Amino acid sequence: HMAMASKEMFEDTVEERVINEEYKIWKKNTPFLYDLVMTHALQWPSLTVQWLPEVTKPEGKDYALHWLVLGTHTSDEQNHLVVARVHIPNDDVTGKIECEIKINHEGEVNRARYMPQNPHIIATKTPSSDVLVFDYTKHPAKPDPSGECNPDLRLRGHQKEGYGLSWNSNLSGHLLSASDDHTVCLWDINAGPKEGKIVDAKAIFTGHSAVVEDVAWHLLHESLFGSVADDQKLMIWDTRSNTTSKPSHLVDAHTAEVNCLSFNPYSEFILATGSADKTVALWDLRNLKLKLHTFESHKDEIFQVHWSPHNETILASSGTDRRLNVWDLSKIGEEQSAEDAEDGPPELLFIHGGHTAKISDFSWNPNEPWVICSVSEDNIMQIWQMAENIYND
Amino acid sequence: DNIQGITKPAIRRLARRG
Ligand SMILES: [As]
């Protein structure tokens, strides 16, 4: 009645102190651990990040241009889908971030992903039911303050919101989406009618019995895709199969809810999975029954997992423990001393401790090896790169 | 031996402790 609503705080003042002191120590250690570390505080936290595939080294400049696809998270005010332009300094204060474009968006951006075949086409997941599609070359350079959201395409099929989003790298226009409605929708944005901005799901997969958390196309076989849900099950589907309620394979992947999955860009067989049981599981398509390996070290739920686009044996995972772990499969099962075994398994390459809140997403840079961008719930975004000294002898 | 070889195990340990 008298007391105000406080969206800060709103924090745990005890945990805050611990987090901050661990951050101070991390910061003075950065010169040892990183060849590059850049930080920026966004006005609103971003739940999503993805590098655009374009890079350029402008003549006469001592840096390189890179682009990020970001989003906004406000429940009170106007949301935007944003493409940021960044200067990453040449290896031979530091750095710069700017806005290439900013697009009026209804509700927060749960996830934003670009179409590999046409990088200026971007799909987004809304707090509503529709997933949206924007062509950013057809939107004004600066957004209208009125806040009107005019997506180039609205895709219908879901009853609730979601996060899982995946373009097909081999089938242009084919998009997958996961949702809290227990389903996984499929669209072909090339077909539909002549007008206007509304297309229907081509398929609605109902194999799951709970909130399906993530979805991903196979990077090599254009008809296979994986799904992951709160029923603790990893399912693998086939599009040319005429049954949308029973997958080709069904796996009891974790003891808790499964949050994310990522196919290896080099091996057509292996797959990784992140769960609420604080572990990442390795999977091979030949035999799903056998869980190849289990990555232990995360102290809390894992929400994102991504393979390196340069090194086939490199894996990264982030979660609620505010840490981003980098794994090297080539060091699995390898022997180690007792003092080293106390820090974690041999495949644990690197623990990124620059974030002071949950990491919502991260993205491997496709043009600069070992460069990553991660975003946390406390408005921070970090573009960083592990010290060469650590991965290369 | 060289000095990098001396600080390689130290840095790699620091990396796995965050
Ligand atoms: As920006």
Numbering used by the authors:
A (entry chain B): -2 to 89, 110 to 410
B (entry chain E): 24 to 41
Per the authors:
We have solved the crystal structures of two human RbAp46/histone H4 complexes at high resolution. One complex contains a synthetic peptide encompassing residues 16–41 of histone H4, and the second includes the N-terminal tail of recombinant histone H4 (residues 1–48); these crystallized in different space groups. Crystals were obtained of selenomethionine-substituted RbAp46 in complex with the shorter H4 peptide. The structure was solved using single-wavelength anomalous dispersion (SAD) data. In the selenomethionine derivative, two RbAp46/H4 complexes occupy the asymmetric unit, whereas in the native structure with H4 1–48, there is only one. The crystallographic data thus provide three independently determined structures of the complex, representing different lattice environments. The three structures are essentially the same and should contain all of the important features illustrating how histone H4 binds to RbAp46. The H4 peptide adopts an α-helical conformation that is similar in all three structures, except that somewhat more residues are ordered in the RbAp46/histone H4 peptide structure. In the complex with the peptide (residues 16–41), we observe residues 25–41, whereas for the recombinant fragment of H4 (residues 1–48), residues 27–41 are well defined. Through an extensive network of hydrogen bonds and salt bridges the hydrophilic face of the histone H4 helix interacts with RbAp46; H4 residues Gln-27, Lys-31, Arg-35, Arg-36, Arg-39, and Arg-40 interact with RbAp46 residues Glu-356, Asp-357, Asp-360, Gly-361, Pro-362, Leu-365, Asn-406, Ile-407, and Asp-410.
